[PDB]
């Protein structure tokens, strides 16, 4: 029963109640640069705008609680990120890009304590990340990963290392830009949450950072502001660098 | 509270890391009688389209303001998303054929109006946008002002949702000929099993479509689910296209 424990939440016991995995938000954004050369096969690409509506849905699905003892769970998750040219009525406001991220995993709610920090989540599983397109906009990669989440007072730190498995023919140099792990830091400043999510490949010099700030405006809606800077904001832009700023609303933050 | 009442659920305060569902949430593997290659001929991969597809629906309710118009009312929003995915079509890099995005803003009320055995439980008024996220020439969209009314009686649930089309429907001008002005939903609780039927019919044109389903709990959060769709308007790109589609897979929540 811990703020930010995905798995501890999933263990909690009516049947019309869904569980979140990651953050759920809808924001209005502008990017520094639109990647028009990657989406050149789309008819509307020449007239693509830098202002878009960005949103993420993310859900956890407990399938088997107690598979490996009282504090474990066989679970699934689904994260979806979409970039939508709403203001671009000239081209019938199309979606530029969606990322679909299903996962299947074994999760453990833990309490290992070291140096003031408490390891709360240990999660191991399969991750698929694709963009739902055909050639040549198709982008896709699969990962075996471990997610480890620890908290210390107002801090939350999450490390997610992975191993790429299978084909990456659509984007074979993706690990050059994405790296082999993802770091997440949350900071709780009163009821406000400062957040940072990113990757850095130290042998290639590539990475990207997502910084955010949210605060409850009501007991229903949080205000949320986001900056993304770097490579790999979306699969179609994994090898593309830009800076994006957005404002909007959020249900859940990382803790 | 009451099984099947979206509004009654939305009024229950909870732990802020719990979402509310609006419609059903499911993931099924499907085979259609006919794939509408014609409508999607603009896509490079259209002629190698395969009749087997993954279909899934996500649907969430978002309480914005409880008590806006009294203790049993709510200002809310919903988002329903349906996707058809050519998973098996590795030859074309398994693209999505079609997604429908259905955001709503509404005023809802939890009621207790009993009449001839049936108890009206949900009264909902709001705005609906239904788009496919495409550009010319595959773009399909329509806006609607609707009322949703849900009533129950023993093992039965009946939901009627009549609407009024508003604004331009320039991507699909004759959409009302295949969809109609209302949607009917019937749920039946047979033990832990749920029979469901969801449909529309235009009496003046003879066009319609129906979706029948059966689900059974495997666990407290997961159900096995089978679906048959038959008729017109399964998706926006197929509003004027007739097909029969059968699917099997898993479900979180059924209609009650
Ligand atoms: C924090 C949210 C950013 C607000 C910026 C949104 C409005 C800017 O919109 C801009 O209009 C231009 C011409 O009219 C387009 O060509 C640009 O690509 C578009 O970004
Ligand atoms: C509520 C925790 C009771 C204190 C016993 C936990 C032992 C952990 O040990 C220490 O605890 C301190 C907090 O007491 C931390 O600041 C130290 O850095 C940590 O190493
Ligand atoms: C039995 C002691 C109860 C009083 C605990 C107050 C001490 C606050 O100390 C806190 O201890 C936590 C537990 O290790 C650490 O995680 C925090 O980082 C630390 O500051
Ligand atoms: C989102 C549109 C702006 C209107 C603000 C909605 C106000 C929140 O509304 C209400 O606040 C009450 C007091 O905390 C609670 O008792 C309710 O459960 C909550 O919904
Ligand atoms: C059971 C809840 C529905 C979850 C939908 C996830 C489907 C994964 C999509 C994969 C796209 C490439
Ligand atoms: C919390 C996330 C809600 C997402 C709302 C998306 C609305 C998309 C409309 C696109 C149709 C063309
Ligand atoms: Ca693909
Ligand atoms: Ca459109």
XYZ file of C-alpha atoms and ligand atoms in Angstrom:
617
model
C 0.000 0.000 0.000
C 2.616 2.424 -1.244
C 2.517 5.514 -3.453
C 4.030 4.547 -6.803
C 4.165 0.760 -6.304
C 2.625 -0.595 -9.562
C 2.747 -4.201 -8.290
C 1.567 -3.438 -4.737
C -1.424 -1.696 -6.330
C -2.044 -4.700 -8.597
C -2.149 -6.995 -5.513
C -4.871 -4.888 -3.873
C -8.453 -6.294 -3.975
C -15.441 -3.450 -7.404
C -14.926 -5.485 -10.644
C -15.372 -2.156 -12.531
C -11.983 -0.902 -11.325
C -8.990 -0.638 -13.672
C -5.341 -0.353 -12.615
C -2.853 2.084 -14.101
C 0.746 1.153 -14.936
C 2.448 4.372 -16.136
C 1.029 7.908 -16.261
C -2.196 8.781 -18.037
C -2.229 12.246 -19.618
C -3.435 14.492 -22.467
C -1.358 17.562 -23.318
C -1.028 20.177 -26.059
C 2.520 20.339 -27.439
C 4.865 22.108 -29.870
C 8.105 20.546 -31.105
C 11.274 22.298 -32.275
C 11.511 20.073 -35.367
C 9.038 17.805 -37.190
C 10.575 14.672 -38.750
C 9.049 15.052 -42.248
C 11.645 12.845 -44.013
C 10.664 9.696 -42.073
C 6.935 10.078 -42.856
C 7.508 11.164 -46.503
C 5.231 8.361 -47.855
C 2.202 9.991 -46.177
C 0.322 12.273 -48.581
C -0.106 14.954 -45.883
C 3.549 14.946 -44.734
C 4.649 18.074 -46.613
C 2.056 20.119 -44.670
C 2.689 18.559 -41.247
C 2.642 21.085 -38.372
C 4.851 21.217 -35.238
C 1.862 21.655 -32.861
C 0.207 18.346 -31.884
C -1.945 16.748 -29.171
C 0.088 14.171 -27.233
C -1.525 11.608 -24.975
C -0.617 8.442 -23.123
C -2.868 5.684 -21.790
C -1.318 3.069 -19.540
C -3.062 0.135 -17.790
C -1.926 -2.841 -15.695
C -3.803 -6.155 -15.789
C -3.409 -8.628 -12.887
C -3.924 -12.071 -14.451
C -2.696 -14.389 -11.663
C -2.026 -13.089 -8.130
C 0.016 -15.379 -5.884
C 1.536 -17.397 -8.731
C 4.879 -17.492 -6.863
C 3.735 -16.690 -3.304
C 1.568 -14.055 -1.551
C 3.542 -11.026 -2.823
C 3.884 -11.993 -6.477
C 1.762 -11.522 -9.604
C 1.657 -12.715 -13.183
C 0.619 -9.537 -14.970
C 0.275 -7.676 -18.247
C 0.421 -3.989 -19.107
C -0.419 -1.829 -22.150
C 0.990 1.634 -22.802
C -0.078 3.736 -25.772
C 1.382 7.082 -26.857
C -0.144 9.135 -29.711
C 0.845 12.313 -31.568
C -2.119 13.973 -33.308
C -2.105 16.903 -35.768
C -5.401 18.330 -34.383
C -4.919 21.900 -35.642
C -4.100 20.627 -39.172
C -7.629 20.679 -40.603
C -6.068 21.370 -44.051
C -4.974 17.689 -44.014
C -7.994 16.344 -42.030
C -6.121 16.407 -38.659
C -4.368 12.992 -38.973
C -2.466 11.083 -36.336
C 1.245 11.317 -37.098
C 2.402 8.413 -34.928
C 1.224 6.034 -32.223
C 3.393 3.716 -30.149
C 1.792 0.508 -28.830
C 3.640 -1.049 -25.878
C 2.230 -4.362 -24.517
C 4.150 -6.243 -21.779
C 3.895 -9.607 -19.970
C 5.696 -9.982 -16.649
C 6.224 -11.571 -13.247
C 6.069 -8.926 -10.523
C 7.032 -8.949 -6.845
C 6.057 -6.438 -4.160
C 9.141 -6.227 -1.929
C 10.585 -4.477 1.180
C 14.385 -4.877 0.913
C 15.844 -1.814 2.723
C 19.350 -0.448 2.177
C 20.732 3.016 2.964
C 17.334 4.586 3.701
C 15.926 3.271 0.372
C 13.235 0.577 0.126
C 13.104 -1.628 -2.963
C 9.355 -1.922 -3.561
C 9.004 -3.453 -7.022
C 10.936 -6.183 -8.771
C 9.471 -6.925 -12.185
C 10.773 -9.172 -14.982
C 9.086 -9.683 -18.331
C 8.720 -9.240 -22.123
C 8.176 -5.878 -23.837
C 7.063 -5.263 -27.428
C 7.163 -1.679 -28.786
C 5.790 -0.969 -32.256
C 4.138 1.829 -34.221
C 1.473 -0.103 -36.149
C 2.736 0.995 -39.601
C 3.738 -0.922 -42.749
C 6.891 -0.206 -44.810
C 8.623 2.136 -44.788
C 7.272 3.963 -41.663
C 7.248 0.611 -39.747
C 9.257 0.718 -36.528
C 9.512 -2.087 -33.939
C 11.694 -3.778 -31.272
C 11.313 -6.405 -28.534
C 13.008 -6.511 -25.142
C 13.447 -8.758 -22.111
C 13.652 -6.379 -19.173
C 13.751 -5.977 -15.412
C 12.085 -3.056 -13.671
C 13.333 -2.157 -10.179
C 11.618 0.555 -8.158
C 12.898 1.980 -4.876
C 11.623 4.852 -2.690
C 13.304 7.068 -0.013
C 11.003 9.674 1.596
C 10.035 12.115 -1.156
C 12.198 10.303 -3.737
C 11.302 7.532 -6.184
C 13.955 5.962 -8.420
C 13.196 3.369 -11.103
C 15.787 1.549 -13.193
C 14.625 -0.520 -16.190
C 17.511 -2.436 -17.892
C 16.781 -4.559 -20.964
C 18.092 -7.008 -23.559
C 16.904 -6.627 -27.145
C 15.715 -9.979 -28.532
C 14.687 -10.846 -32.102
C 14.631 -8.792 -35.301
C 15.095 -5.061 -35.452
C 15.191 -4.861 -39.295
C 12.910 -1.775 -39.260
C 15.332 0.185 -37.015
C 18.465 -1.984 -36.511
C 20.508 0.841 -34.823
C 17.748 1.646 -32.278
C 19.960 0.639 -29.338
C 22.457 3.267 -30.526
C 19.825 5.913 -29.626
C 17.834 4.182 -26.851
C 20.568 2.482 -24.873
C 20.195 -0.578 -22.639
C 18.309 0.901 -19.671
C 15.858 3.642 -18.715
C 16.039 5.739 -15.566
C 13.081 7.376 -13.859
C 13.260 9.824 -10.951
C 10.243 11.214 -9.102
C 10.323 13.961 -6.469
C 7.328 14.721 -4.219
C 7.284 18.454 -3.326
C 4.129 18.633 -1.219
C 1.327 17.306 -3.452
C 3.344 18.341 -6.554
C 5.479 15.828 -8.497
C 8.725 16.605 -10.334
C 9.644 13.791 -12.712
C 12.495 12.838 -15.064
C 12.579 9.831 -17.456
C 15.469 9.140 -19.800
C 18.223 7.062 -21.385
C 21.866 7.761 -22.326
C 24.118 5.508 -24.422
C 27.591 6.393 -22.998
C 29.422 4.652 -25.889
C 27.460 6.543 -28.596
C 26.620 9.829 -26.843
C 22.920 9.508 -27.686
C 20.005 9.952 -25.296
C 16.788 11.705 -24.416
C 15.127 13.197 -21.368
C 11.528 13.799 -20.395
C 11.065 16.246 -17.537
C 7.684 16.958 -16.054
C 5.785 18.810 -13.346
C 2.261 18.044 -12.183
C 0.005 19.185 -9.398
C -3.557 18.241 -8.337
C -5.930 21.018 -9.468
C -8.778 18.880 -8.154
C -9.279 15.435 -6.675
C -9.866 14.301 -10.288
C -7.492 16.198 -12.519
C -3.824 17.138 -12.256
C -2.299 19.968 -14.222
C 0.757 18.709 -16.087
C 3.607 20.349 -17.997
C 6.158 18.337 -19.933
C 9.425 18.978 -21.749
C 10.986 16.314 -23.929
C 14.505 16.873 -25.266
C 16.720 14.508 -27.248
C 16.382 11.380 -29.344
C 13.747 8.665 -29.303
C 10.629 10.557 -28.248
C 8.690 8.173 -30.528
C 9.657 5.141 -32.624
C 9.443 7.130 -35.893
C 11.829 9.650 -34.265
C 14.162 7.184 -32.512
C 17.092 8.503 -34.568
C 15.754 12.075 -34.621
C 16.559 14.885 -32.166
C 14.011 17.523 -31.077
C 12.763 19.520 -28.060
C 9.005 19.452 -27.311
C 7.006 21.436 -24.696
C 3.482 20.544 -23.631
C 0.758 21.539 -21.143
C -2.473 19.767 -20.257
C -4.088 17.340 -17.822
C -3.066 14.130 -16.064
C -4.799 11.428 -14.022
C -1.858 9.728 -12.311
C 1.791 10.729 -11.968
C 4.554 8.210 -11.219
C 3.822 8.511 -7.491
C -23.355 -0.170 -5.853
C -25.386 -1.320 -8.824
C -23.831 -3.763 -11.302
C -23.648 -2.074 -14.708
C -24.237 1.535 -13.570
C -21.383 3.560 -15.105
C -22.563 6.679 -13.246
C -23.013 5.002 -9.832
C -19.449 3.693 -10.219
C -18.164 7.167 -11.096
C -19.742 8.595 -7.906
C -17.846 6.142 -5.682
C -14.642 7.767 -4.342
C -11.742 5.342 -3.794
C -6.336 5.342 -3.314
C -5.973 7.656 -6.365
C -4.301 4.990 -8.560
C -7.538 3.327 -9.762
C -9.277 4.167 -13.057
C -13.009 3.710 -13.836
C -14.162 1.841 -16.957
C -16.950 3.205 -19.208
C -17.541 0.583 -21.894
C -16.088 -2.897 -22.074
C -12.325 -3.552 -22.215
C -11.250 -6.529 -24.292
C -8.650 -8.055 -26.628
C -9.769 -10.706 -29.086
C -8.481 -12.553 -32.126
C -10.909 -12.317 -35.011
C -11.678 -13.518 -38.521
C -13.955 -11.495 -40.796
C -15.999 -12.779 -43.746
C -14.776 -9.880 -45.897
C -11.965 -7.306 -45.602
C -12.894 -3.900 -47.092
C -9.896 -3.482 -49.413
C -11.753 -0.889 -51.503
C -12.061 1.815 -48.837
C -8.360 1.491 -47.950
C -6.983 1.184 -51.509
C -4.875 4.297 -50.799
C -2.662 2.267 -48.403
C 0.245 0.581 -50.212
C -0.532 -2.711 -48.367
C -4.358 -2.774 -49.074
C -4.464 -5.670 -51.607
C -2.427 -7.980 -49.326
C -4.878 -7.362 -46.460
C -5.729 -10.523 -44.518
C -9.209 -11.419 -43.057
C -7.695 -12.334 -39.648
C -7.091 -9.437 -37.265
C -6.609 -8.503 -33.631
C -9.496 -6.413 -32.355
C -9.373 -4.569 -29.057
C -11.342 -1.925 -27.224
C -10.199 0.313 -24.367
C -12.810 2.332 -22.530
C -12.387 4.652 -19.501
C -14.606 7.056 -17.568
C -13.136 10.182 -15.976
C -15.044 11.882 -13.113
C -14.364 15.600 -13.439
C -16.914 16.987 -10.959
C -19.115 14.950 -8.606
C -22.187 16.758 -7.214
C -22.278 19.475 -9.908
C -26.118 19.210 -10.070
C -26.874 17.470 -6.754
C -25.591 14.455 -4.757
C -26.313 11.875 -7.494
C -24.928 13.746 -10.493
C -21.542 14.001 -12.183
C -19.689 16.008 -14.834
C -17.644 13.387 -16.635
C -15.622 12.446 -19.639
C -15.028 9.129 -21.347
C -12.670 7.745 -23.980
C -13.381 4.651 -26.050
C -10.900 3.307 -28.573
C -11.360 0.395 -30.990
C -8.490 -0.945 -33.118
C -8.201 -3.506 -35.926
C -4.666 -4.794 -36.340
C -3.273 -6.976 -39.146
C -1.030 -8.876 -36.678
C -0.494 -11.976 -38.832
C 0.332 -9.880 -41.914
C 4.122 -9.963 -41.473
C 4.432 -9.696 -45.294
C 3.273 -6.052 -44.885
C 4.907 -5.463 -41.420
C 1.606 -6.095 -39.520
C 0.026 -2.593 -39.832
C -3.073 -1.274 -38.080
C -5.934 -1.228 -40.563
C -8.212 1.113 -38.567
C -8.687 2.758 -35.163
C -11.781 4.596 -33.922
C -11.276 7.301 -31.267
C -14.435 8.135 -29.291
C -14.088 10.912 -26.644
C -17.214 12.104 -24.800
C -18.143 14.928 -22.402
C -21.350 14.446 -20.421
C -23.578 15.128 -17.449
C -24.668 11.926 -15.692
C -27.226 11.097 -12.981
C -27.685 7.926 -10.884
C -31.470 7.367 -10.520
C -34.012 4.948 -8.946
C -37.139 5.546 -11.115
C -39.005 2.171 -11.040
C -41.659 1.662 -13.770
C -43.386 -1.622 -14.786
C -40.737 -3.825 -13.100
C -37.740 -2.005 -14.677
C -35.636 0.480 -12.668
C -34.065 3.381 -14.614
C -30.570 3.608 -13.147
C -28.514 5.872 -15.432
C -29.540 9.092 -17.267
C -26.679 10.611 -19.322
C -26.544 13.713 -21.593
C -23.427 14.710 -23.537
C -21.309 15.233 -26.668
C -19.640 12.502 -28.726
C -16.837 12.774 -31.315
C -15.998 9.628 -33.339
C -12.957 9.821 -35.682
C -10.511 7.350 -37.287
C -7.420 9.619 -37.188
C -6.937 9.490 -40.955
C -6.376 11.984 -43.770
C -8.001 12.167 -47.242
C -9.238 9.929 -48.586
C -9.680 7.437 -45.688
C -10.817 10.035 -43.081
C -14.167 9.246 -41.386
C -15.776 11.284 -38.582
C -19.136 12.426 -37.117
C -20.216 14.402 -34.017
C -23.296 13.664 -31.953
C -25.389 15.052 -29.090
C -26.814 12.034 -27.282
C -28.697 10.725 -24.270
C -27.846 7.366 -22.716
C -30.552 5.699 -20.602
C -29.901 2.458 -18.703
C -32.528 0.364 -16.921
C -32.371 -3.011 -15.112
C -34.916 -5.771 -14.204
C -33.717 -8.932 -12.418
C -31.086 -10.555 -14.658
C -31.668 -8.036 -17.471
C -29.999 -4.742 -18.377
C -31.283 -2.547 -21.280
C -29.423 0.558 -22.510
C -30.850 2.906 -25.178
C -28.670 5.681 -26.608
C -30.455 7.928 -29.125
C -28.510 10.804 -30.712
C -28.582 13.805 -33.023
C -25.809 14.254 -35.647
C -24.339 17.812 -35.496
C -22.043 19.698 -37.865
C -20.397 18.522 -41.068
C -20.042 14.822 -41.896
C -18.227 15.611 -45.194
C -15.995 12.492 -44.982
C -19.051 10.163 -44.789
C -22.220 12.153 -45.772
C -24.594 9.144 -45.723
C -23.397 7.637 -42.378
C -26.936 7.944 -40.844
C -28.306 5.578 -43.539
C -26.141 2.743 -42.089
C -26.044 3.733 -38.365
C -29.447 5.231 -37.556
C -30.218 7.578 -34.640
C -29.954 5.189 -31.708
C -28.021 2.268 -30.277
C -29.568 -0.528 -28.267
C -27.714 -2.616 -25.694
C -29.098 -5.712 -23.954
C -27.266 -7.576 -21.170
C -28.262 -10.877 -19.553
C -26.672 -12.324 -16.392
C -26.827 -16.152 -16.515
C -25.013 -17.115 -13.316
C -21.516 -15.625 -13.650
C -21.834 -15.676 -17.449
C -22.866 -12.534 -19.327
C -24.770 -12.511 -22.625
C -24.623 -9.179 -24.414
C -26.065 -7.646 -27.601
C -25.222 -4.214 -29.015
C -26.777 -2.789 -32.151
C -28.359 -0.179 -34.372
C -30.947 -0.361 -37.150
C -32.301 2.266 -39.551
C -35.959 1.338 -40.248
C -36.110 3.782 -43.161
C -33.164 2.236 -45.044
C -33.032 -1.367 -43.804
C -29.376 -0.930 -42.775
C -28.000 -2.038 -39.412
C -25.506 -4.141 -37.503
C -25.381 -6.237 -34.355
C -22.712 -7.426 -31.958
C -23.442 -10.475 -29.787
C -21.138 -11.691 -27.059
C -20.590 -14.170 -24.224
C -18.098 -13.837 -21.376
C -17.199 -15.882 -18.328
C -14.840 -15.040 -15.396
C -11.573 -16.987 -15.301
C -10.487 -14.807 -12.380
C -11.564 -11.739 -10.423
C -10.187 -9.376 -13.131
C -10.047 -11.534 -16.288
C -12.898 -13.028 -18.365
C -12.902 -15.320 -21.388
C -14.888 -13.598 -24.140
C -16.368 -14.580 -27.515
C -17.870 -12.072 -29.925
C -19.798 -12.148 -33.208
C -20.365 -8.938 -35.175
C -22.645 -8.929 -38.198
C -23.825 -6.128 -40.471
C -22.764 -2.583 -41.370
C -20.783 0.029 -39.448
C -18.397 -2.151 -37.412
C -15.781 0.589 -37.868
C -15.898 4.057 -39.415
C -13.972 2.895 -42.528
C -16.580 0.110 -42.880
C -19.689 2.158 -42.057
C -21.071 1.429 -45.530
C -19.542 -2.080 -45.624
C -21.216 -5.354 -44.606
C -19.224 -8.160 -42.892
C -19.567 -10.994 -40.356
C -16.768 -11.252 -37.822
C -16.103 -13.780 -35.088
C -13.580 -13.297 -32.285
C -12.318 -14.985 -29.130
C -10.059 -13.641 -26.415
C -10.021 -11.925 -23.010
C -12.026 -9.209 -21.276
C -11.648 -7.125 -18.120
C -15.180 -5.854 -17.570
C -18.431 -6.844 -19.293
C -21.496 -4.564 -19.451
C -22.446 -5.777 -15.948
C 2.844 25.020 -25.200
C 2.023 24.776 -26.468
C 2.680 25.395 -27.702
C 1.732 26.382 -28.366
C 1.983 26.562 -29.859
C 0.764 26.231 -30.701
C 0.565 27.225 -31.843
C 1.710 27.291 -32.869
O 1.299 26.659 -34.092
C 2.172 26.817 -35.198
O 1.495 27.479 -36.286
C 2.264 27.538 -37.513
C 1.656 28.383 -38.633
O 0.395 28.928 -38.241
C 2.456 26.119 -37.980
O 2.976 26.122 -39.301
C 3.402 25.520 -36.943
O 3.985 24.276 -37.343
C 2.631 25.421 -35.622
O 3.426 24.854 -34.570
C 11.371 3.870 10.010
C 12.769 3.300 9.924
C 13.333 3.022 11.312
C 14.850 3.182 11.327
C 15.541 1.842 11.111
C 15.859 1.622 9.637
C 17.322 1.293 9.438
C 17.839 1.847 8.135
O 19.154 2.386 8.220
C 19.319 3.783 8.183
O 18.133 4.424 8.547
C 18.177 5.819 8.547
C 16.766 6.088 8.945
O 16.564 5.632 10.275
C 18.584 6.284 7.154
O 18.632 7.686 6.930
C 19.947 5.722 6.909
O 20.560 6.295 5.785
C 19.735 4.241 6.805
O 20.928 3.582 6.456
C 11.253 3.444 15.091
C 11.636 4.785 14.505
C 10.408 5.537 14.010
C 10.758 6.975 13.644
C 11.393 7.048 12.261
C 11.772 8.481 11.907
C 13.115 8.528 11.194
C 13.097 9.205 9.846
O 14.225 8.783 9.104
C 13.894 8.200 7.852
O 13.942 6.797 7.946
C 13.464 6.152 6.803
C 13.440 4.698 7.165
O 14.722 4.142 6.981
C 14.430 6.431 5.704
O 14.024 5.809 4.500
C 14.436 7.897 5.483
O 15.268 8.111 4.348
C 14.910 8.519 6.792
O 15.138 9.912 6.792
C -12.798 19.953 -13.558
C -13.701 21.161 -13.772
C -13.433 22.231 -12.720
C -14.406 22.113 -11.539
C -13.668 21.629 -10.283
C -14.340 20.388 -9.709
C -14.413 20.423 -8.190
C -14.158 19.062 -7.542
O -15.400 18.437 -7.234
C -15.559 17.819 -5.964
O -14.844 18.382 -4.868
C -15.423 17.975 -3.593
C -14.704 18.635 -2.403
O -13.342 18.182 -2.278
C -15.461 16.439 -3.432
O -16.293 16.137 -2.303
C -15.929 15.720 -4.724
O -15.871 14.278 -4.609
C -15.214 16.331 -5.971
O -15.663 15.826 -7.238
C -7.603 -6.470 -22.261
C -7.400 -4.968 -22.387
C -7.048 -4.420 -23.788
C -5.544 -4.169 -23.949
C -5.097 -3.872 -25.390
C -3.629 -4.233 -25.654
C -3.385 -4.725 -27.077
C -1.906 -4.648 -27.469
C -1.746 -3.931 -28.843
C -0.508 -4.320 -29.675
C -0.315 -3.432 -30.917
C 0.902 -3.672 -31.825
C -6.473 10.598 -21.112
C -6.355 10.400 -22.627
C -7.590 10.764 -23.492
C -7.251 10.828 -24.994
C -8.230 11.680 -25.823
C -7.953 11.513 -27.324
C -9.016 12.098 -28.265
C -8.569 11.737 -29.676
C -9.439 12.209 -30.840
C -8.870 11.910 -32.243
C -9.938 11.653 -33.338
C -9.613 12.129 -34.767
Ca 5.214 -2.521 -38.041
Ca -9.334 12.813 -39.758
